[PDB]
Every structure is written in C-alpha cells, then in structure tokens.
C-alpha cells in the first residue's frame, strides 16, 4: 500500500494546482493528514482562509 | 590600503597549515585591487563672490564630498598610510562657513572608513565571517547613496542650502558614526570567529542607554552570527564538520576520540563562553558513537537566532546535550556491554573465585616456587585453561582474555625474583570500552591483584605444614602457627567483606544512576583509587611492616622447616628458631597495629575482640 499512497499523493498534487487552491506541497501534506482523522473538509476551508487573512493583518 | 595583500597571504597560509580540510581557496582577481574605481572612495575663486553664491557653491560641492566624487571648489587629498579622508577647501573661504563645513565633514569621514571594509574585507582568506559583515553593511551603504540622490533632486530645484543639509545629516552622523566606530575596531586586530562576536557583544553593550545605536549593533551581529550558526547547526546535531575557515571553537585535527576535536581559546563567542565546555562534549559523543557503529543524528533540533541579552537560543543546545550523552550511555550499557565486561574483570582481578585459584596453586606450585626466567609460559597457559574449566567459571565468554604475564618486581612497578611474585594478568579491552577504561585502570587492577596474591599464597603454605605434621602430640610450632594463622585469616576477612565487595556492589548501582560519561568516569575512579589505598600499600615506606610479617611467615613455614626437613616425615634446635621468629613476629605485629591506630580501623577492632594481646607496651 506504501507504493500506492505515494503515487496517489503525487496525482493528488496536480488537481490541487489546476483547481487553483492555495495549497503547495507542504500544506497539501498537512491537509491530507488532517482529513485522515475524519474532519469535515467544508469546515477546514474557512480556517485556512481566516489564517491567510490574519497573517496579512500583521504585515 | 596597502596592508591587505600581506593580510591575504598570511591568512591563507595560516588557514592551510593547521588542517587540510580545504586548500587553494579563491583569491579574487587582480583588476579588483588595481582599480580604485571599484572601491567606493578613491575651480573659480570663491573669495570675491557674493555671500549667498558662496553658500550655494559650498553646499553643492559638499554633496559630492559625501560620496567619492570630486567637488567643484574643493578636492580630496590623497590618503596616505592614513585611513579616513581629509579634504582641501579653496582659499579665501568665509570664516563663518569654514566652521560649519567642519560640522558636515564628519559624514564623509564616517563614510571613508566604511566602504574600505565592504570593498575589500569580505574574501575567503579573511575567514567566512567578514563575508556576512560585508553583506549587511552593504545594505546600509546602499541606503546612504539613496539619501544622497534624494537630496540632489531637491538641490536641482533651488531647494537646498547649507542649513537644510545641516539638519538632514544629523541622522547621517548619529548612525554612520556608529559604523565608522565599529568598522575600525573589527578590522584592526584579527577578529575571526568568536573574537568578533565577543567584540560585538561588547559594542552592543556599549549602547544600551542610547537606544538609537543598540538596534543597529544588534542588526550587524545578527547577520554576523548566521554563518557561525550554520556551523553550530552541524556540530551540535551531527559529528560532521568540514570548516576550513576556522571560524569555530572546535577545530578538526587531521591526526581518535579525544585527540580530534579541541576547543580553541579565541574562537569562542562571549555569550556562549559559559557554555563552551558543553558544546564540544555534546558534539563529540555523536561522532564517537558512529566510530563504534551507531547513528549520528540528533532528532531534537531547531534553528538558531541571536537575541541581545535574552536567551532562547542557548536553550535548544541543552536539549541536544540531553540527547547525546544519554544515547551514548544507553548505547554502551546494553550494546557491547560494560556490565558483563566489568564482571569478567571482577572474576579474576578481585579474585572472585576461590576454586580456580586453589586449582591453579596446586597445579603450578613447583613452577611458582622457581625464580623468573626458570619458568615455562606455554605449560602455564595450558594449566590455567585446565584449572578454569574445572571450576565454576566457564559461563562468561570473556574468560579467554587471560594471558601469561610476568612482572618480576616486589612492588617496584609502583603506580632474581620468584615466580610467585612475577605473576599478573594482561586483559584485552574492546574499542568502545577503551574510551573509559584504559592503561591506567588496568595498571591499578594489576597492582591490586599483586597485593591480594600474597594473602592467597601464604594460606597454602600454612595448610600444607599444618596437615603434614599430623607429630600427633607436639605443640612447639603449633603456637606460632596459630597466632600467625589467626592474623592472616582476619586480614583476609577484613579486605574482601569490607574493602572490596560492598563498594563494588555500590558501584554497580551508581553506574545505573549516571547520565554522562564524566559521571561513570567519576564513580569508577573513586572505587579503584580509594579501595587500593584502603588495602595496605600507602606510606612513603609503603608499609614494609606487612611485607616483613609475610616474610617471617614464609620463612617459618617453608624456608626454615622444609616440613621438619624430612627428619621423620632433634635437640630442639628447630624450636629455638621458632622462639626467635616468634619474638620478631610480635614486634612486627605490634608495629602494624600501632601504625593503623595512629593514622585516622575495623581489623584492629575485630582482631582484639575481647582484649586479645591489645596491651604489651604502648607508644608515648
């Protein structure tokens, strides 16, 4: 399975790039590990945008 | 600056001879040095003009003087062997303006001793620390030229005179002066590695009450600490160093486990000077455990950034100190064991067997009686391997380390002769445990074995003559023998059940409570030195009373008797020598007892159990 979940991790990258999401490789790994727990992703979509707003609040 | 070529040559050669970790570092091209136009620093009569034309002319040339550009009614005189630029104003300048110009001239003077560092003192010969100093002093000089251009644009619109310039340059001589002070002290005197970082922990403490210049000094040393932090981000977490620029306190030596990595005194920054001993140790443990086949990485690791007078960055260093010396200890005690190794030392040097030695003593008695170089070493190795396998001891796998060792001495190998007093052991140790136990400990264990051998040896001599007489109704020898026998068995009770076995037992608990290699080295040296001192060896005379007591014991049992010289086994001539030996023996016994009493216990306390020959005469 360890063969399969590296290749599915690589194909998972392209559809996150072409859908124009804010994710790069690192944040993609954080988010795939976070969804693996069982969290609803429609909730995660708001906390990522609130972090990216309040990050710009400092600078 | 003419000095710089000599500096580069001397620096490069000095780096190269110490270690060959990197040679022939690049010397920057010759046309860089030959042009003074790659370095930031290299008319009409003013006397009859109107006053305002004079102020407008001088502010115009002064803005050129702030950079390396020739003025319209002023020039820059050549420097000398001197550092900062002086300038040459036009005759008949106004006496009002001349004083004000010398208030504005310190900006150009504090610009002269800035670019000469940046445009030369950054190269590989100078270390890898003059780099980043000229990599955050360059941004400030860029800012200087920015300010000069922004001033010139206002000058073109008729909107600059000497007074506006005078207001403008107070930010440029409260800030550029700090640089022109730091630069001519870092440059003068070799400041490489930690010495710079101590000078910038001295000149960031020089401003703590100004608050204008303090942030600036912190900015300069926060860029100069970054390459040092780069080297500190290997050594603490791996054993790996390359570093041919010798900017670090630890130096790679091209030659083991203590002769490779060594602290250098002038390569220590001031704010880690207290922590300098921990750095080398924590780094060294990771490399030496990979020398004995193990991992080198420290999986607790973070990145390091400087703060003036606050600590969070000498903190993660302690967390790798809480890994390195505790992964090496846990490596040693359970892998390539020090517990079974120490027990296999215990088995013979502390003579843990009584069986193996009485087998040995019976098998080798004839050869032990003969002097040295009247002995047969290949026969004795065979007899030792026999007597070992007959006994209890066959279970440890380190029994093979024993070889035949001759030390013909009478303890003149201090920390002809007979075979009994020329028998020792040489024990082979492994490379991981060689780090702690070495030639000194092995020598002390050998000397302890030598002292214990005589006490073991005289017992066989007593028991042989004791059984050989049993004739059955005789008591002439049976009095001297009984007195000596009680003594030589109580010395043997005192020494092991007091001097050796309890503290060996304590040491095997104390090593499990150690946390550093230094800790184990403390406990082991305590036991080995003090217990050997506890047994009767220490005096300047080395306690000859003990040896002469043993001498008259052996002389009584074998040298004078030979088991009544096989007379039946006369005039009671043999009983008179018993009497003479007995008087000498009383003298020696009292000498040893009084010597142990007078030096500030238990062997006297149990030998004299109820007033048993405790008074015949007493000193003073």
């Amino acid at each position: 399975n360890l063969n399969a979940v590296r290749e599915t991790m690589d194909v998972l990258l392209e559809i996150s790039r072409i859908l124009n999401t804010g994710l790069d490789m690192e944040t993609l790994s954080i988010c795939v590990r976070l969804c693996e727990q069982g969290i609803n992703p429609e909730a995660l979509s708001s906390v990522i945008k609130e972090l990216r707003k309040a990050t710009e609040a400092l600078k | 600056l003419q000095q710089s070529l000599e500096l580069k040559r001397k620096m490069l050669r000095d780096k190269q001879n110490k270690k060959n970790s990197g040679q022939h570092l690049p010397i920057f091209p010759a046309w860089v040095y030959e042009r003074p136009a790659l370095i930031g620093d290299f008319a009409l009569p003013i006397g009859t003009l109107p006053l305002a034309s004079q102020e407008s002319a001088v502010v115009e040339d002064l803005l050129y003087v702030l950079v390396g550009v020739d003025g319209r009614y002023v020039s820059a005189q050549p420097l000398a062997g001197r550092q900062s630029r002086t300038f040459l104003v036009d005759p008949n300048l106004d006496l009002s303006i001349r004083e004000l110009v010398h208030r504005i001239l310190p900006v150009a003077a504090s610009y002269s001793a800035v670019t000469r560092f940046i445009e030369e003192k950054s190269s590989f010969e100078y270390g890898q620390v003059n780099h980043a100093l000229a990599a955050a002093m360059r941004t400030l000089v860029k800012e200087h030229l920015i300010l000069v251009s922004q001033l010139e644009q206002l000058h073109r619109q008729g909107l600059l005179s000497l007074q506006k310039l005078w207001f403008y340059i107070q930010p440029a001589m409260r800030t550029m002066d700090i640089l022109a002070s730091l630069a001519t002290s870092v440059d003068k005197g070799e400041c490489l590695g930690g010495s710079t970082l101590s000078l910038l922990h001295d000149r960031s403490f020089s401003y703590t009450g100004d608050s204008q210049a303090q942030e600036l000094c912190l900015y300069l040393t926060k860029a100069a600490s970054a390459p040092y932090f780069e080297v500190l981000e290997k050594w603490i977490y791996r054993g790996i160093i390359h570093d041919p620029y010798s900017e670090f306190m630890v130096e790679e030596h091209e030659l083991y486990w203590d002769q490779r990595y060594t602290i250098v005194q002038q390569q220590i920054p001031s704010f880690l000077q207290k922590m300098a001993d921990k750095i080398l140790s924590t780094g060294k443990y990771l490399n030496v455990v990979r020398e004995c086949g193990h991992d080198v990485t420290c999986p607790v690791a973070k990145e390091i950034i400087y703060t003036l007078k606050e600590r969070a960055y000498v903190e993660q260093i302690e967390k790798a100190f809480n890994y390195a010396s505790k992964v090496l200890l846990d490596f040693l005690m359970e892998e390539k064991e020090l517990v079974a190794h120490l027990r296999s030392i215990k088995r013979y040097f502390l003579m843990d067997q009584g069986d193996f030695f009485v087998h040995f003593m019976d098998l080798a008695e004839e050869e032990l009686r003969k002097p040295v170089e009247d002995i047969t070493p290949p026969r004795l190795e065979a007899l030792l391997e026999l007597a070992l396998r007959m006994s209890t001891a066959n279970t440890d796998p380190f029994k093979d380390d024993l070889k035949i060792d001759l030390m013909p001495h009478d303890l003149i190998t201090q920390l002809a002769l007979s075979g009994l007093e020329a028998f020792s052991f040489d024990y082979i140790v492994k490379w991981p445990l060689s780090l702690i136990i070495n030639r000194k400990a092995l020598t002390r264990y050998q000397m302890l074995f030598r002292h214990m051998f005589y006490c073991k040896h005289v017992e066989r001599q007593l028991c042989s003559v004791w059984i050989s007489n049993k004739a059955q109704w005789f008591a002439g020898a049976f009095t001297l023998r009984q007195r000596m026998l009680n003594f030589v068995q109580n010395i043997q009770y005192y020494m092991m059940f007091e001097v050796m076995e309890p503290t060996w037992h304590i040491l095997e608990k104390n090593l499990k409570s150690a946390s550093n290699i230094d800790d184990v080295l403390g406990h082991h040296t305590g036991f080995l030195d003090t217990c050997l001192k506890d047994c009767m060896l220490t005096n300047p005379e080395l306690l000859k009373v003990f040896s002469k007591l043993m001498s008259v014991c052996v002389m009584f049992t074998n040298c004078m008797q030979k088991f009544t010289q096989s007379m039946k086994l006369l005039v009671s001539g043999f009983e008179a020598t018993i009497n003479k030996f007995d008087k000498n023996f009383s003298a020696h016994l009292l000498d040893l007892l009084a010597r142990l009493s007078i030096y500030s216990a238990s062997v006297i306390s149990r030998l004299d159990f109820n007033g048993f020959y405790t008074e015949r005469l007493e000193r003073l």
């Binding site: 124009n20 999401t21 944040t27 | 644009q153 800030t175």
Partner: protein, 158 residues
C-alpha cells in the same frame, strides 16, 4: 492531537523572520472559525461543473486533463472535497494545431487563417506580460528616487 495539526497549519502559513506572540493569536484564529459552521450529489459531478466553465473559456486540453485524472483516481475522497472549496483564491512550441507541416498523412481541411491569428495572441499575452514587469520595476524605484528625503528609510528615526 488534531488540535496540534492546527498549530502546524499556522507554522507553514506564517514563516519566521517578535515572532512568538503572533502564532498563539493565529492559533486562536484557527480555533475560533472552525465551529461556527458546525453549530449551524456526488463528488466528481462538481468537477464536471468546473470543467465546463474551462471549456466555455476555451483551453480544451486543460479540461481534458482535469477529467483524465479524476477518472483514474476513481478507477482521498475528502481531500478533493477541500480543493473544490479552496478553488480560485490561490496562486495559479506546439506544431500540431495550426502547423500542418508535421504529422503523418495530415488532415485535409484546405487552409487556416482563423486559428493562425490566435496563434500570435498566444505570444502576444507573453509580450504583454514581460513589459508589465518592466513597468513594475521602474515604478518601485521611481517611488524611491523621487520623494522628500528619508520617508522610505527609517534612518531619520535614528
């Protein structure tokens, strides 16, 4: 814990250059927005609905690739469900279309003048982009060369 992965989300999205008090406030920001939605159709169908607007805006092979990957990822369901909700707020020759000189038995359609004209626009967008860089490099520096002195540098504050 799961609440610890939210600290690592704050770690990636804010790099370090203070910087020990901002991260706890951002951790509060990460916690405070998660539970407001929790108090108050298949997955690949939305992918088709988004490939449609691509094809409306031209750019055929991108839609043909987006449909190519979900077809083999069904031949991880909850992570693409995040990407459709993060869409459109992040950062974003060939001689076989209008060159009939290469191929093997090339298709016969007469000639072209109606996609060969949008083959210059393929370069015209690049030519219009690499001049906007030099408009935005002359502007950032004319904002420094022209000002009253020291209002872009804090050196007057020293």
């Amino acid at each position: 814990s799961i609440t610890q992965l939210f600290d690592d989300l704050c770690e990636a999205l804010l790099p370090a250059a203070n910087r020990k008090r901002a991260k706890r406030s951002l951790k509060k920001v990460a916690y405070n927005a998660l539970f407001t939605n929790l108090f108050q159709l298949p997955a690949r169908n939305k992918i088709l609905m988004l490939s449609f607007d691509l094809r409306v805006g031209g750019l055929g092979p991108k839609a043909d690739r987006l449909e190519e990957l979900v077809e083999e990822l069904e031949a991880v369901g909850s992570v693409l469900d995040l990407l459709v909700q993060l869409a459109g707020s992040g950062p974003p020759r060939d001689y076989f279309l209008n060159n009939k000189h290469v191929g093997r038995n090339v298709p016969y359609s007469g000639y072209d003048c109606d996609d060969l004209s949008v083959f210059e626009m393929d370069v015209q967008s690049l030519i219009s982009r690499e001049e906007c860089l030099c408009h935005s490099m002359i502007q950032e520096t004319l904002q420094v060369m022209e000002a009253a002195p020291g209002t872009g540098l804090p050196t007057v504050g020293l």
